[PDB]
From Swiss-Prot, chain A:
Belongs to the membrane fusion protein (MFP) (TC 8.A.1) family. Monomeric in solution. Homotrimeric; interacts independently with AcrB and TolC as well as AcrZ. Part of the AcrA-AcrB-TolC efflux pump. The gene is acrA. This is Multidrug efflux pump subunit AcrA. AcrA-AcrB-AcrZ-TolC is a drug efflux protein complex with broad substrate specificity that uses the proton motive force to export substrates. This subunit may act as an adapter protein that links AcrB and TolC stably together. It comes from the Bacteria. It is found in: Cell inner membrane.
Swiss-Prot record, chain B:
The chain holds residues 347 to 395 of 493 of the full protein. It is found in: Cell outer membrane. Homotrimer. Part of tripartite efflux systems, which are composed of an inner membrane transporter, a periplasmic membrane fusion protein, and an outer membrane component, TolC. The complexes form a large protein conduit and can translocate molecules across both the inner and outer membranes. TolC interacts with the membrane fusion proteins AcrA, EmrA and MacA. This is Outer membrane protein TolC. Forms a continuous, solvent-accessible conduit: a 'channel-tunnel' over 140 Angstroms long that spans both the outer membrane and periplasmic space. The periplasmic or proximal end of the tunnel is sealed by sets of coiled helices. It comes from the Bacteria. Belongs to the outer membrane factor (OMF) (TC 1.B.17) family. Disruption phenotype: Cannot grow on efflux substrates novobiocin or fusidic acid. Outer membrane channel, which is required for the function of several efflux systems such as AcrAB-TolC, AcrEF-TolC, EmrAB-TolC and MacAB-TolC. These systems are involved in export of antibiotics and other toxic compounds from the cell. TolC is also involved in import of colicin E1 into the cells.
Length: 53, 49
């Protein structure tokens, strides 16, 4: 939409803005998801080492 | 008068085209603005119409 200059470079700036931060929110999410899942990984206790129990 | 009548007309007449001729250009990309915006579907086709 910017090829033929049909928007505001300002505008496109704004669009990329969230599109930038959006994924970051995603990053905030996947980081989040792993967190609990990690805890669910904590649940189902893993032997932190190997050997005779 | 008539001498000055149209001689103005044509000139102002000239100004006419220059406006709309631009104005056409105005709508021109304006159309184009639509089609792309519709081409990408950011906008409807009705607008293009």
């Amino acid at each position: 939409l910017l090829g033929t200059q049909y928007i505001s470079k300002q505008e496109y700036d704004q669009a990329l803005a969230d599109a930038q931060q959006a994924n970051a929110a995603v990053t905030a999410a996947k980081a989040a998801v792993e967190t609990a899942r990690i805890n669910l990984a904590y649940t189902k206790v893993t032997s932190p080492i190997s050997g005779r129990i | 008068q008539t001498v000055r009548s149209s001689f103005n007309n044509i000139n102002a007449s000239i100004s006419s085209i220059n406006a709309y001729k631009q104005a056409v250009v105005s709508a021109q990309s304006s159309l184009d603005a639509m089609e792309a915006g519709y081409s990408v579907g950011t906008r409807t086709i009705v607008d293009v119409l």
